[model samples]
Target: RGSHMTPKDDEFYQQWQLKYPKLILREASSVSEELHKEVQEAFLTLHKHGCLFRDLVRIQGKDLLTPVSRILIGNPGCTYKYLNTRLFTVPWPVKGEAEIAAACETFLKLNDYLQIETIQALEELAAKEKANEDEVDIKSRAAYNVTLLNFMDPQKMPYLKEEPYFGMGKMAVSWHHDENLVDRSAVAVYSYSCELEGRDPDIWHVGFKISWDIETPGLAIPLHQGDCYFMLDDLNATHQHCVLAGSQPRFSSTHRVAECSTGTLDYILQRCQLALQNVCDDVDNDDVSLKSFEPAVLKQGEEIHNEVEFEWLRQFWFQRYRKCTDWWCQPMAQLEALWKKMEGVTNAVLHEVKREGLPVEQRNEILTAILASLTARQNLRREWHARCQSRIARTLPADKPECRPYWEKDDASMPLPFDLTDIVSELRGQLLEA
Candidate 1:
């Protein structure tokens, strides 16, 4: 077929060559609380080696299973761009309806400030003005005068009201980290949606902007996405050719971006949620106890048909993960191997559960136990990897006599010490670090 297209530039490929080093440097500099112990051990090894200017941004996206991608560190150019999976199709709060009304109210209020006479006019202007798609073929817009990209298809919208908003908000959980890309002092941006009230079968897209960086000099900006209650909230809208079908249509993450060989990219987003929850300010009493994310819907009297919002589980998780960064690229071999290993262990436990014919309570208890165990084991493995990386990191030579000029044409000055071994080790440490 003459359909194969070539890359416009080698920039992405060139960046790939430097990706490992970038990841290592970035990891050595930051770590997650849960993975701290492991990260420190790895850092010790990395510190003994060398300091190179590797690219962390690329590594984080590649190593999705690890905390490196999910956890944000206190550094610039590392903004956290994903939302919690639970936030998508979150449970209706006690006052979810009222919350929608409030958001709508805010929209109208802001429009009033913009000199728009009516909400319909404002919507028409928005639909027409903010229609351009991004490089990735996703619809984007600026809300409250800030760039806000919508990431959902309101087509599957639901009905919500004040009570629902409260219930959903109650069901939702907050996460935090200083590792975000923006200034450490900048506030965090939240994007979510709730079903609408007194309307057709539709949902209301919610965009929340809070300032996490009060000390920073940049102005506060609100972040938002998803679509209006009436429009089809195209999460990754715009036309794009499918790697398989070679057709351009807005496709869901699972269908288009996620790899079948590995689990959905949402797994990384799930890690993001866990990262924030690990450092959240308001600790819920229930969170003190270990819990397992319900991976499989329980079979009820009727096979749990029309079970609780599960499509949202997959959709939201994916949205959150992709939003964090361009993690949609091909899966990293290293991460795929790790995922396979985890899956093997999970399968074994699941088989044992089936053989035992365990009761629901027993199975739940064991599953939670398994989750905690997996967490501990994964953390340990990450730490060990970091430590192992340290040994390889020390063998590289440093920049000889003087600091090399990055822009000069001379090759004798010696290339920077940002080696591949160092980059991998550093990111490994970050993934394992606390």
Candidate 2:
């Protein structure tokens, strides 16, 4: 009657067991006991590297931020974008501090091959077979990067802290695929938990359903403390997965082959770098707006530059909107006008080219090339516009009263920083007048 294992009993003709090559489940006992113990102990080091923050979450027909208790961590350009927001850079390898310094050392060890016996053995077997993927003989030589460490201490989570849930209904993280990850790459997740004094912790599960269908008799695989699993090639793409909530505090280290496309990465990093400079500029200038966003430690006139020098990161975390540079925030009327003006310019160019009679054959060739390029750009713009429009509707629906998480909902409506489409409006008046 419980949902912990794939099939708790052999009630059906077919035994319910994890047999898929794409999605495999392993028990804690599968890995070395000593290794598991060390991993659980390292939770504190991972905790220190994390900061309390909230991302954009839609609730009550209003766009609002979630409770700030979620402890999120990322390293350098490995900034993670999730739930429609991106993480500010959190640097690793704390130079001299013994605890954090030791954490990154072990962190890299896991990153190389997540110390999971199944994966390591598979890699060894793969080397001998000299094969890859469905090739059956070889495993992927590529290692996971963009190391993300998430710690969920019930003490920090307001709902779970005061009153733990013994049910297996919903989890802290809901159903979703890795929003931005490289295609056909493996994802490794290792679970770590802390001993608690007064709570009957529910068995945390990783639930999977095929292709977003509700009728798919979803499978649940218990991911106990120190247990690890992999979403090998297309498994993540084909099935949506989520972490079922637990009563006890837990930490998950997710090392993934994140998408580092120039389109997404460099553009985000560029905005982050500018944020860093602007934060520093605030300190030097009189009106220091950025000081409000940082945590208490950074606000106090502490030694400005110390070993853990990430003042910009502290500022960036509290900053809600990272898209103020371009404000495509005009009304539908103005937007249509802009589109019409753009099209008119294109048509005018074509008309002039067609009128040129000096070279009749060359004219025909030029007109064809121009027409194709125009249509190409028009198609690209159409898709871009449709995606932008749908993004607003894609967030979690506010109808469910139970959709609330362990943290409290923030009251403020869409804040200024997240209004990514209004800054260019100033240019419109002057340019259009000219």
Candidate 3:
């Protein structure tokens, strides 16, 4: 009668477990123990590779403190943002090749027709599969470019200072789907080690939405060491899943197959960089002034060789604004006007330097004007944040405390660097010399 899982909890999973061709859970028979050892060894190599060791909680003044540690591996520039933390991918470590190859084997076994001659052959197959996206088969649909290794240590919980729940342990993850993906086909999650007593860590999949009028149940699967689960079909979209954190240590490796048709690695890399900026959660109180927004001041001998970098930086800024277009408690009309005005100034700067053949003296004048406009744009950001802060201070009706506003939350608001800050600084000096 206690909180242990009952039959009702697993009704949804039982009903539709075998219906989906894409959904499959398998154990790594020959590959299990060896993969475990390799994963443990790679876990040791994590510190050298700069794996993140912070949880997703925030401190005062817009600083984020991460409790759940993780590392992203796979192709270059693969970035994943979750719980307000942005993780950029590093190349898969050499030590992890055996485990990674083994994991790839398990995936191959799940789909027997999928080729698996050697590690190199597997890599080639993946490349070939990604190139042809017209077919909706498992081959063309699956192209894993990134793997997320997460280590959830029980001892790293952040202590809450406030009265009621002060100094209590916090769970590493809450109930949620692996959302915010860019054309991801499937996810392969392997449990490296999840040792615990009493109730083993269970993954709950809420298959269908439950309305208040009816009683509905979901699947609770107890995942152990070396157990691999492949999320396929539309399962991710329909069902929300979560790992219930226990007192013992837990390690999970999630490999994500990105949509190959999206673009090249470089384009995706640029998008990843811009995506981080677009989230608007990277801001901090450190140097939020107009000067902070200025490009770095360059020295005499250097010149801005590539003007194309400025275009990307401007795109980053514009994208950020577009992502957060629904700025609450502010007039949308004014926001649109400001955006258009900034766009005009940005285009003018680009045109003057790249197209119009202006005199040297006149070029310097245009550069100065562009610099001034950049400062003004920073001022606009300051004004917007100030307005958001004012809204944050306002209380809800009937004396109820309002939910903390986004502008005041450290995780939600912090110092954002202009993508072109450095590029502009380098170009400014070169332009003045011209």
Local distance difference test values of all predictions, in order: 0.24, 0.45, 0.41
Instruction: Name the runs in model 2 displaced over 4 angstroms.
Output: 1-5, 11-20, 48-75, 92-96, 115-142, 154-168, 194-201, 263-434
Clashing pairs in 3: 54-66, 54-67, 55-66, 55-67, 55-68, 62-410, 283-414, 283-415, 284-414, 284-415
Among these predictions, the greatest lDDT belongs to 2
Which residue segments of model 1 deviate by more than 4 Å?
Answer: 1-55, 58-141, 144-236, 239-434
**Candidates ranked by lDDT, best first?**
2, 3, 1
Every model's TM-score:
0.19, 0.53, 0.48
lDDT of 3 by residue, 236-317 (tens): 6665555545556667767666433322335533433332232223343222112111222210001121111221222122
Best by TM-score: 2
Candidates ranked by TM-score: 2, 3, 1
Candidate 2 lDDT, 314-350, residue by residue in tens: 2232233222111111221232332222222333333
Which regions of candidate 3 deviate over 4 angstroms? 1-13, 16-23, 28-32, 47-50, 55-66, 82-85, 93-137, 158-171, 182-184, 194-215, 259-265, 268-434
